[PDB]
């Protein structure tokens, strides 16, 4: 269903968000950050 350019575009978005978000500003946001990383790992598991 997904093309290769779509997959990389989405992965790149996940990475950017994980890298720049305030995921280390509070414990609450830390969890949010962890969830985001969990979402990316799930996506990586499928396209790989």
């Amino acid at each position: 269903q997904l093309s290769d350019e779509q997959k990389e575009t989405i992965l790149k978005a996940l990475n950017d968000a994980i890298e720049k978000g305030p995921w280390d500003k509070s414990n609450f946001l830390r969890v949010i950050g962890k969830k985001l990383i969990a979402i990316r790992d799930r996506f990586l598991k499928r396209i790989g």
Binding site: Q1, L2, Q6, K7, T9, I10, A13, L14, D16, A17, K20, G21, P22, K25, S26, F28, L29, I32, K35, L36, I39, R42, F43, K45, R46, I47
Partner: protein, 56 residues
């Protein structure tokens, strides 16, 4: 397995959408604080980009 347009919406867009809603609750409770609002912005940015990537 493998990612599809569906799994993008069910396994990425929806979860992120949920996170935004929850962070919104933290904002509504704790005014002072730039972090929670920055987080919503980043997540909104994420979803708009993912949705466009999936629709094209």
């Amino acid at each position: 397995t493998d990612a599809t347009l569906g799994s993008v919406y069910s396994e990425i867009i929806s979860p992120v959408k949920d996170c935004i809603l929850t962070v919104a609750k933290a904002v509504s409770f704790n005014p002072g604080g730039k972090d929670n609002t920055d987080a919503v912005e980043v997540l909104t940015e994420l979803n708009t980009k993912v949705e466009r990537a999936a629709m094209n």
